[PDB]
From a paper:
The activity of GlcNAc transferase V ([name]) primes the biosynthesis of an N-glycan antenna that is heavily upregulated in cancer. Introduction of this 6-linked GlcNAc residue is mediated by the enzyme [name], and ensuing elongation by other GTs can give rise to a long glycan chain that serves as a ligand to immunomodulatory galectins. Overexpression of [name] is frequently observed in a range of malignant tumors and generally associated with a worse prognosis. [name] transfers GlcNAc to the NGA2 N-glycan intermediate in the secretory pathway. Here, we report the development of a BH strategy for [name] as a GlcNAc transferase with outstanding biological relevance.
Toward capturing a BH-[name]/[name]-GlcNButAz 6/[name] crystal complex, we crystallized a variant of BH-[name] bearing a substitution of the catalytic Glu297 to Ala to prevent [name]-GlcNButAz 6 turnover without altering the fold of the enzyme. However, soaking experiments using [name]-GlcNButAz 6 ± [name] failed to yield any structures of the binary or ternary complexes. To understand how the BH mutations are positioned within the active site, we solved a crystal structure of the triple [name] variant E297A/F458V/F517L in complex with [name] and [name]. This structure closely aligned with the corresponding WT-[name] ternary complex, with a root-mean-square deviation of 0.49 Å over the entire protein (988 aligned residues for chains A and B, superposed by Cα atoms). The gatekeeper residues in WT-[name], Phe458 and Phe517 overlaid directly with the BH-[name] variant residues, Val458 and Leu517 (insert). While the latter amino acid side chains adopted a similar spatial trajectory as the parental Phe side chains, the space occupied is substantially smaller, enlarging the active site as a defining feature of BH engineering. We further investigated the combination of [name]-GlcNButAz 6 with MGAT5F458V/F517L, now called BH-[name], that showed the most favorable conversion among all putative BH-enzyme/substrate pairs. We found that the azide group is preferentially oriented toward F458V and F517L, well positioned in the cavity created by the BH substitutions. In contrast, our BH-[name] variant displayed increased acceptance of [name]-GlcNButAz 6 while completely losing activity against [name]-GlcNAc 1. Taken together, BH-[name]/[name]-GlcNButAz 6 are a selective enzyme–substrate pair, mainly driven by the negligible activity of BH-[name] toward [name]-GlcNAc 1 compared to WT-[name].
Author numbering: 214 to 467, 471 to 614, 618 to 728
The structure:
């Protein structure tokens, strides 16, 4: 039985009216419905969407179980976290439009019931939910393991995913050690090439008459602070004052930390928030929270984003929030994606403590022409293409990307495979490590092994050019885009990517 694209949302609304928790998600969908429907039709017109098998898909939202104790549903409308719920909403909508057979679960009862009656070919779950899956199913949970796609915002690096290696390194993460293929982890932003980038869609309501008259609509000296709760505002006053010299400063806050001059609007409904963004020249980052959606929404509406620079980068080594996350990734700014893949004039990444630099950025932004912008990968059509490619082409059970995409590179000592790929405008592709892990295979890529040994280490395969000595991976679950060798070179698998669609190679569709 073959999937048919859907262009009507009534079945979806009915499925989401089954739990109150889904209420917030259901409303965002309704606001974005016409965009979604334009996008599935446009994709079907550009690319052949026929001949897809209709999948039975479990979607288990562990974060919405009582049993998790997360209280996300509870605070959804009153200024709590929404990033995750944005992502889930967009994933469900995508699956529905592509014509799959979605069974949504927010409870142990439903999880048990859907798995109970068989058929399931694909499972979207979070880490909290994955623990529940293992516990509910007992030992046969491993039978489903290759169908798992695990929503994990900040990402999982190989050294935390391999249970035995993580313990040999003393890592106490409660989040790691599932022993999956790390490409099964689905992230919020393309920051972890050991994982896959899932993302979400950036909500925007600018017609092309809004964009032509955007200069009438936007008040040139209006800034808005990013930061829904009071805590995030501690010790920002110098920064805010420099901004307040040039611009009014507005906030949407659910207050001891906020100066008297700030103009508060409270927490706004999605529509009202979108209008406030459309009238705003400058969205002001305070440092927290890390890697959320809100800055991209502002950029889509023509705001510049002032992005706090982190020198040293923040990570588990230096920031409590990061301790125990199953990754050693370092953030160079509040929103590294915004910093690296968007940049000026939309994104000004600045040292909050450099008054001169802050002042120059504010005066610059004040003087910039308004240019609303969205990377393609965060549109409806671009997210549909990405997830459609993943469902049709990612298989961890029984060759994608195809070998023709492989471009081998040598990281220097002190540089990771992530880095050397990125420096040549490529991205690391962990599925190709298996093709560069033997004497023969090396010769090809213009490195000669005068002696090899095996090792079980994330930093290998490695090459010493002085000694012509090669080390190969002994444990194939330890292949790792993350990690730099302190003294040797790494042999690194890179691939190309489509403009504005970093998850997909040119030949991947
Ligand atoms: O007054 C507000 C402020 C924010 N948001 C939304 O809350 C979401 C979460 O954005 P943020 O980057 O703050 O991430 P979080 O930390 O909540 O995951 C975004 O879609 C914002 O538009 C909202 O609905 N009303
Ligand atoms: C709301 C939610 O579950 N979000 C994230 C999750 O995606 C991530 O896997 C985990 C570990 O870093 O931290 C939390
Ligand atoms: O991870 C989601 C959520 O988990 C905890 O249980 C809560 O107390 C929150 O502070 C946190 O954000
Ligand atoms: O985003 C909500 C909250 O979920 C939990 C943890 O992921 C935190 O790291 C995060 O802030």
């Amino acid at each position: 039985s073959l999937a048919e694209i859907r262009t009507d949302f009534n079945i979806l609304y009915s499925m989401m009216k089954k739990h109150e928790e889904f209420r917030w998600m259901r409303l965002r969908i309704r606001r974005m419905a016409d965009a979604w429907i334009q996008a599935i039709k446009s994709l079907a017109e550009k690319q052949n969407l026929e001949k897809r098998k209709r999948k039975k898909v479990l979607v288990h939202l562990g974060l919405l179980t009582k049993e998790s104790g997360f209280k996300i549903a509870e605070t959804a409308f009153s200024g709590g976290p929404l990033g995750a719920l944005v992502q889930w909403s967009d994933l469900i909508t995508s699956l529905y439009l592509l014509g799959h057979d979605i069974r949504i679960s927010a409870s142990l009862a439903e999880l048990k019931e859907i798995m109970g009656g068989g058929g399931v070919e694909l499972i979207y779950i979070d880490i909290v939910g994955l623990a529940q899956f293992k516990k509910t199913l007992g030992p046969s949970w491993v039978h489903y393991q290759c169908m798992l796609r695990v929503l994990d915002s900040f990402g999982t690096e190989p050294e935390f995913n391999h249970a035995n290696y993580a313990q040999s390194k003393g890592h106490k993460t409660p989040w790691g050690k599932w022993n999956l293929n790390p490409q099964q982890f689905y992230t919020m932003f393309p920051h972890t090439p050991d994982n896959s980038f899932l993302g979400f869609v950036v909500e925007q309501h600018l017609n092309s008459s809004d964009i032509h008259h955007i200069n009438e609509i936007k008040r040139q000296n209006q800034s808005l602070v990013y930061g829904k709760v009071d805590s995030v505002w501690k010790n920002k006053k110098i920064y805010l004052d420099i901004i307040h010299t040039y611009m009014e400063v507005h906030a949407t806050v659910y207050t001891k930390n906020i100066p008297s001059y700030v103009k508060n609007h409270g927490i706004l409904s999605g529509r009202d928030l979108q209008f406030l963004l459309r009238e705003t020249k400058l969205f002001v980052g305070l440092g927290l929270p890390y890697e959320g959606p809100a800055p991209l929404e502002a950029i889509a509406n023509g705001c510049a984003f002032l992005n706090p620079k982190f020198n040293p980068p923040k990570s588990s080594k230096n920031t409590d929030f990061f301790i125990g996350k199953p990754t050693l990734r370092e953030l160079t700014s509040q929103h590294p994606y915004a910093e690296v893949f968007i940049g000026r004039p939309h994104v000004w990444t600045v040292d909050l403590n450099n008054q001169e630099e802050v002042e120059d950025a504010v005066k610059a932004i004040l003087n910039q022409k308004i240019e609303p912008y969205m990377p393609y990968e965060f549109t409806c059509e671009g997210m549909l293409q990405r997830i459609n490619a993943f469902i049709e082409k990612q298989d961890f059970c029984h060759m994608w990307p195809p070998l023709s995409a492989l471009q081998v590179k040598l990281a220097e000592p002190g540089q990771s495979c992530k880095q050397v790929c990125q420096e040549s405008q490529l991205i690391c592709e962990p599925s190709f490590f298996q093709h560069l892990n033997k004497d023969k295979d090396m010769l090809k890529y213009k490195v000669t092994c005068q002696s090899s040994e095996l090792a079980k280490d994330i930093l290998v395969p490695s090459f010493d050019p002085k000694n012509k000595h090669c080390v190969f991976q002994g444990d194939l679950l330890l292949f790792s885009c993350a990690g730099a060798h302190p003294r040797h070179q790494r042999v690194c698998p890179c691939r190309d990517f489509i403009k504005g669609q970093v998850a997909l190679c040119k030949d991947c569709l």
